């Protein structure tokens, strides 16, 4: 039931070629359900609403920093850029940003 990885982060939305932040306080986390499937999730830290809940298998996606912004923007990108989910880090310090990125990739692509 415990989250395999978690970190505060907000969402962003891409329209045309412009990516704009959602202002909400949020939490990205990875969790294994009782049926052993791996879920990548985002929840509103204020309301508690789980707004994104994706079931991920190895080689579906990669989590990578977005140099275009540094605003600490990361994107979850599905195979052939079919889907992109953008996030901005909300941890007060940057010291774990890269390790959070490594752990996301590890648990999604080698759980």
């Amino acid at each position: 039931n415990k989250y395999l990885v978690e970190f505060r982060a907000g969402k962003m939305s891409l329209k045309g070629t412009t990516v704009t932040p959602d202002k909400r306080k949020g939490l990205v986390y990875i969790q294994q359900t009782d049926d052993s499937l791996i879920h990548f999730c985002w929840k509103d830290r204020t309301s508690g609403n789980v707004e994104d809940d994706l079931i991920i298998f190895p080689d579906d996606c990669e989590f990578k920093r977005v140099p275009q912004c540094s605003g600490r923007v990361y994107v979850l990108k599905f195979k052939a850029g079919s889907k992109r989910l953008f996030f901005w880090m909300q941890e007060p310090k940057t010291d774990q940003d890269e390790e959070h990125c490594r752990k996301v990739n590890e648990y999604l692509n080698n759980p």
């Binding site: 932040p21 202002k23 306080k25 605003g71 909300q90 007060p92």
Partner: peptide, 12 residues
């Protein structure tokens, strides 16, 4: 304290 949102940006 918690960071403010980044400014919008272009993604090509």
């Amino acid at each position: 304290q918690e960071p403010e949102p980044p400014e919008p940006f272009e993604y090509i």
